[PDB]
Amino acid sequence: QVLPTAANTEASSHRLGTGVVPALQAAETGASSNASDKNLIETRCVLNHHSTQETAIGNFFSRAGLVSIITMPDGYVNWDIDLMGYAQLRRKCELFTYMRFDAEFTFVVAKPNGVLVPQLLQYMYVPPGAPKPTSRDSFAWQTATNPSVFVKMTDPPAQVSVPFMSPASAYQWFYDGYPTFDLDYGQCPNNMMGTFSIRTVGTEKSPHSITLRVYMRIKHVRAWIPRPLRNQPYLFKTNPNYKGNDIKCTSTSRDKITT
């Protein structure tokens, strides 16, 4: 059903009788009560036009966020592709279990102190099983088939679009089981989407340190089976392990229950 706006409130009056009772409910059945405000108090007729577009999953998720930072103090680094490295986004996408979406990436590159220097960089996306470069002049940099991006540092940040590349129907943030017939537990093969590598094009030694920031935007998202959020700080990038001593309470405590 379509609900462009929240339901209006109808007029009501006092009620006195036997048998009918909307106030009493049955929470043991596990169903939220369907009692409306018009069934307990006298309410005037109020028409509301509060739209619900801002609460759609697409608008809620359509916000770029930092996913990882890369520093280049040999001239190249091969960074594995993962999106669970920062809480600010991990908590957001971990509320659901399975989501199918479309990712858009943006790369911001600058020196450690933020100064900009003319320098040419190259980015390659290595699918799983593809050869992995091991040197600034490795033969794997010929990018015969793998996609490549070339951009100068002074140029505006690059923007690319990545389709949904999982073998399964949708990504899964949890895998209760083993992929093979203890650290292995919880590793879903359907999430390893290859790695990422950056380098300086010149065969010489670059004289400036390189820092890259990657922001991921989402679109055409579709969620399934929402799960409760997380109220404990993360400890690892793969499993929900937590500090077993300082169990943080969900709600801040007070002095007395009567006040």
Partner 1 sequence: NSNSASTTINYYKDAYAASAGRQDMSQDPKKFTDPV
Partner 2 sequence: IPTELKPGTNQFLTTSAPILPGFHPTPPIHIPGEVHNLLEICRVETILEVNNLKTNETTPMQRLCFPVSVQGELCAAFRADPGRDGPWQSTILGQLCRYYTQWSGSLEVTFMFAGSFMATGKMLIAYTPPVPADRITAMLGTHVIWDFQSSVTLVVPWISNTHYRAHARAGYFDYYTTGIITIWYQTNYVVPIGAPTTAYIVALAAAQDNFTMKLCKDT
Partner 3 sequence: DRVAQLTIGNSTITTQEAANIVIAYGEWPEYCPDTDATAVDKPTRPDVSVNRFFTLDTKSWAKDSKGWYWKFPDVLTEVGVFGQNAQFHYLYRSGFCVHVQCNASKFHQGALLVAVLPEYVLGTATTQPGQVGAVLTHPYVLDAGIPLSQLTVCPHQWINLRTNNCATIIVPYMNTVPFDSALNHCNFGLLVIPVVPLDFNAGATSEIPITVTIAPMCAEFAGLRQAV
The residue (of 76 and 96) whose beta carbon lies closer to partner 1 is 96
From the list a second copy, partner 2, partner 3, none, partner contacted by residue 196 (C-beta under 5 to 8 A by kind): none
- Residues forming a β-bridge with 125: 196
From the list partner 3, a second copy, partner 1, none, partner contacted by residue 4 (C-beta under 5 to 8 A by kind): partner 1
21 binds partner 1 (CB under 8 A): no
CA distances from 193 to 54, 80, 131 (A): 31, 9, 14
For the segment 112-141, give every residue that binds partner 3 (CB under 8 A).
none
44 binds partner 2 (CB under 8 A): no
| Distance in angstroms (rounded) separating the CA atoms of residues 244 and 49 | 48
Contacts of 8 (CB under 8 A, 6+ apart): 45, 46, 47, 48
Report helix, strand or coil for 144: coil
Task: Return the range that interacts with a second copy (CB under 8 A); candidates 3-11, 112-120, 164-172, 243-251.
Answer: 112-120
- Residue 215's nearest CA partner among 100, 58, 108 is 108
Check the CA dihedral 237-241-246-248 and report its sign.
positive
Write the interaction track for partner 3 spanning residues 147-176; mark x where CB under 8 A is met and - where it is not: ---------------------xxx-x-xxx
CB 194 within 8 A of CB 115: no
| Distance in angstroms (rounded) separating the CA atoms of residues 197 and 116 | 21
CB 209 within 8 A of CB 117: no
The residue (of 245 and 259) whose beta carbon lies closer to partner 3 is 245
Q: How far is the CB of 207 from partner 2 (least distance, A)?
A: 23
Q: Which of 12, 62, 97, 146 binds partner 1 (CB under 8 A)?
A: 62
For the segment 44-103, give every residue that binds a second copy (CB under 8 A).
63-66, 86-89, 92
The residue (of 62 and 187) whose beta carbon lies closer to partner 1 is 62
CB 160 within 8 A of CB 219: no
From the list partner 3, a second copy, partner 1, none, partner contacted by residue 164 (C-beta under 5 to 8 A by kind): partner 1
Q: Which of 10, 36, 185, 243 binds partner 2 (CB under 8 A)?
A: 36
CA distances from 135 to 109, 126, 138, 196 (A): 21, 15, 5, 14
What does the binding site for partner 1 look like in residue numbers (CB under 8 A)?
1-4, 29-32, 34, 51-53, 56-59, 62, 100-102, 161, 163-164, 219-222
What does the binding site for a second copy look like in residue numbers (CB under 8 A)?
63-66, 86-89, 92, 108, 110-121, 139, 141-145, 147-148, 150, 152, 154-157, 200-207, 211, 213
